[PDB]
Ligand binder design. Structure first.
Ligand SMILES: N=C(NCCCN(CCNC(=O)NCc1ccccc1)C[C@H]1O[C@@H](n2cnc3c(N)ncnc32)[C@H](O)[C@@H]1O)NC1CCCC1
Ligand SMILES: N=C(NCCCN(CCNC(=O)NCc1ccccc1)C[C@H]1O[C@@H](n2cnc3c(N)ncnc32)[C@H](O)[C@@H]1O)NC1CCCC1
Ligand SMILES: [Ca+2]
Ligand SMILES: [Ca+2]
Ligand SMILES: [Ca+2]
Ligand SMILES: [Ca+2]
Lengths: 331, 331
């Protein structure tokens, strides 16, 4: 937890995030095409970092913006507020949104709480917690989140996991036989979600959607997330795992603006995420691939991912337990 | 601390370390050219990881080897001990060397406790702590450590720090003026030690040495390490900072074997480390560059690095406080 706020304390991290053109431009467009929703309103900016969303709120005419930031990035936001001549309008409050005091309720909460697969980092729990400060007529920006799942075929990725583990086949590494660890090494590679982009041609079925409505949802809804799926296979081949991406919608008065990290859309720094099965499933076009993705929040600010899939027509089944805290960055 | 043992729990980390050819080959050569020092002896392997050094001890004829490992890598070492038919000779003890019980004192302690700049990670403190289990005739492998410091000239590295920070000059980043943060960003880049290799031609003076004798030294000797230096400048130019590397010596009966991470030597995964000054010093050939490097152990398993240097002939002086827990990996 002291490791999490240190890492977000670095101007190099804020720079890397601000250089995501889709992320920065989409938030500006969401807030400013919906400027009447901000005009003379009160705004809470949760995990504000450098404060850019507070500035966007100010561009839209907000009367008062409370910018809450738990890391030492708070003192840098304060410097930009003074230097952009907005001390009367933007108030930086150093601390966790759970532990700080605001003097008044707000019309609108803005935030960027999305991790890889949306739920990673569980700053979503802090976004929902912040609703205690929201007037009952109030909005949230973003408003809803959709996670997309789809089965994929990628024998290169699958085989790459075996190739990495084949170091451990050496029967004489300096007179030591490593081979009894090859299986454990394979296992550990397969437990890593793969973060990179891929061509949509590798998807074998249309995605299924799981929606979180941030206006209605509560902190506890996210300890255990259950995503049942029935896929109508559009292609015949080995299914090597499930691909994940997410969309969030900023639902204003004037306009609904979407931020999409789909593989059909321009690349973002969220990329997309793939979880391999231990063992691939053969499916023909016309078969159904059914099962559950389960996300269980662990006391390490992340999620255990359980995936179970079965081809209904053959009963060929495959699973994996993956660890969203040890991603493999293949990009 | 739960983050440190998790990270060393991964077979991919053990593989990456074993693929350091100089590291693996030098340890095998040290232990096996000095096999009479192991023949029928008792051995403590501190932070054994996968157990390779215990296997080297066994190749040399050791009677009993206690392999202590605090991470879940312990259960993988146990698998290799069973599969290499050595359960009578190698005993894996899961836990910290500080908290576990050995039934007998040992003739020799072996370990790989060197971090970047030698002291990084402070597993050296665990190596010295282990001496409570060492017979008074006992040896330590490795036996001594030398840290080397030398001044360097590298205007490309120096200027690269400004180039990175120039993102923050933008007077209209989406209608926000970032420029008041440019200085803080420069500052933060200069506080990162640079981990990569370089051509010896960039060194401006012969290195100075600071020796740790692991046989004599005690845990507390490493809370505060003071490295005074007087450099006789061999070249005329800007001195942009200090370069660091280290050598350890395995001093056996038969042979002293050196593991060197010097820039004249074959590359290792320790690379070398450079700390920039805020401001470079002009020195002519014949001048003396004098000052102190100070390492202060912080409660984050790392060191605050203080560097002060002055050209005696001009009194031009320069400093930096660097953070060995936020290295920049430039390689
Ligand atoms: N996006 C992520 N991760 C999401 C979380 C980051 N988050 C948002 C960064 N705020 C940001 O850039 N804002 C400006 C911006 C936003 C959008 C567009 C342009 C500019 C983390 C931030 O919340 C803070 N925090 C965590 N828990 C708490 C708490 N309890 N209370 C208060 N603050 C808390 C943290 O210290 C930190 O400042 N990763 C990368 C993938 C690609 C894009 C970037
Ligand atoms: N070398 C490092 N870092 C140094 C520390 C690593 N260290 C040695 C890895 N042991 C290793 O590879 N051995 C085999 C080997 C050795 C040499 C040659 C071939 C094979 C960390 C290990 O000690 C453990 N630990 C930490 N604190 C404690 C404790 N209190 N008690 C007990 N164990 C503790 C940890 O969990 C872990 O298993 N980094 C890279 C730079 C280039 C080379 C690799
Ligand atoms: Ca503005
Ligand atoms: Ca060999
Ligand atoms: Ca052996
Ligand atoms: Ca712009």
């Amino acid at each position: 937890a002291v490791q999490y706020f240190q890492f977000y304390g670095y101007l190099s991290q804020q720079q890397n995030m601000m250089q995501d053109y889709v992320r920065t431009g989409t938030y500006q467009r969401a807030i400013l095409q919906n400027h009447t929703d901000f005009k003379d309103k009160i705004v809470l900016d949760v995990g504000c970092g450098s404060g850019i969303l507070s500035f966007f709120a100010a561009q839209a005419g907000a009367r008062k913006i409370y910018a809450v930031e738990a890391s030492t990035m708070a003192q840098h936001a304060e410097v930009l507020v003074k230097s952009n001549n907005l001390t009367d309008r933007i108030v930086v409050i150093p601390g966790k949104v759970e532990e700080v005091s605001l003097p008044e309720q707000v019309d609108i909460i803005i935030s960027e709480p999305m991790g890889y697969m949306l739920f990673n980092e569980r700053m979503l729990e802090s976004y929902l917690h912040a609703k205690k400060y929201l007037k009952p007529s109030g909005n949230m920006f973003p408003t809803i989140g959709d996670v997309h799942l789809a089965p994929f075929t990628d024998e290169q990725l699958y085989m790459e996991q075996f190739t990495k583990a084949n170091f451990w086949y050496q029967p004489s590494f300096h007179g030591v036989d490593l081979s009894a660890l090859r299986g454990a090494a394979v296992d550990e590679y397969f437990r890593q979600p793969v973060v990179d982009t891929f061509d949509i041609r590798i998807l074998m079925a249309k995605s299924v959607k799981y929606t979180v409505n941030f206006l209605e949802a509560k902190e506890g809804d996210l300890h255990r997330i259950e995503i049942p799926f029935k896929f109508h296979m559009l292609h015949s081949g080995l299914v090597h795992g499930l691909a994940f991406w997410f969309d969030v919608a900023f639902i204003g008065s004037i306009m609904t603006v979407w931020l999409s990290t789909a593989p059909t859309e321009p690349l973002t720094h969220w990329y997309q995420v793939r979880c391999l099965f231990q063992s691939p499933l053969f499916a023909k076009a016309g078969d159904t691939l059914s099962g559950t993705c389960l996300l269980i929040a662990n006391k390490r600010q992340s999620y255990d991912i359980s995936i179970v899939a079965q081809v209904d027509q053959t009963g060929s089944k495959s699973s994996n337990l993956l660890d969203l805290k040890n991603p493999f960055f293949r990009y």
